Design a protein around this ligand. Structure first.
Ligand code: ZN
Ligand code: ZN
Length: 231
């Protein structure tokens, strides 16, 4: 889990670095890391070069370490091909997700029924992964209802949302964009629809771009169609 440990976990030493540049610092792999002056490590020197263990893209290991300036969730993303090593997870506190389906249609989706997701997160105590470990956090507005059309795309989004939920990515502990309350349970860059009819609050359905948008948001957090498949 330690920052030097995860880089070794996802890399293999390149005995002879071929004649090429490291896309993180632009210095050739056969020469020193361009970030050696800034980044210090215990077991990684300026000349250490290695490749990621699925895509074989090569970098200075110190460059990759300086990159892993991020969440420190044990995950690492190739800057070249964006292949994700490990699994991005988040700080969603404990709670409950329930899924229902009814026949009534959402506006703009009169050809199908509706998926209803209900989330509930109780108040609690922040853990070491949270902004103020050991301090309380609050949780407003629960249970929260969210809506998806019960068509092929909405059913796919639902399956991905369940994965994001299990990865603690749906909610985080942060500052409410609406009340300014700090240390509270808020959304985490995966936008949900919380009303059926957008004309009441200005938020809801129809929204032709919504499903495409949320798939992209899920993918940016490493939740993809490939995550649904099992050998
Ligand atoms: Zn480099
Ligand atoms: Zn790669």
């Amino acid at each position: 889990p330690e920052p030097e440990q995860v880089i070794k976990n996802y890399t293999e030493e390149l005995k002879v670095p071929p004649d090429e540049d490291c896309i993180i610092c632009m210095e050739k792999l056969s020469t020193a890391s361009g970030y050696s002056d800034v980044t210090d490590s215990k077991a990684i020197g300026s000349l250490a070069v290695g490749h990621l263990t699925k895509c074989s893209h090569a970098f200075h290991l110190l460059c990759l370490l300086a990159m892993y300036n991020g969440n420190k969730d044990g995950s690492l993303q190739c800057p070249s091909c964006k292949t994700i090593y490990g699994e991005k997870t988040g700080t969603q506190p404990q709670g409950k997700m329930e899924v229902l389906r009814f026949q009534m249609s959402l506006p703009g989706h009169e050809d199908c029924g509706t998926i209803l997701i209900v989330y509930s997160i109780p108040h609690g105590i922040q853990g070491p992964e949270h902004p103020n470990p050991g301090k309380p956090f609050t949780a407003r507005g629960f249970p929260r209802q969210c809506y998806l059309p019960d068509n092929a795309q909405g059913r796919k989004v639902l399956e991905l949302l369940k994965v994001a939920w299990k990865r603690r990515l749906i909610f985080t502990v942060g500052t409410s964009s609406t009340t300014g309350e700090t240390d509270t349970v808020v959304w985490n860059e995966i936008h949900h629809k919380t009303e059926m009819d957008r004309n009441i609050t200005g938020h809801g359905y129809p929204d032709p771009n919504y499903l495409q948008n949320v798939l992209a948001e899920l993918a940016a957090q490493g939740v993809t169609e490939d995550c649904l498949e099992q050998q």
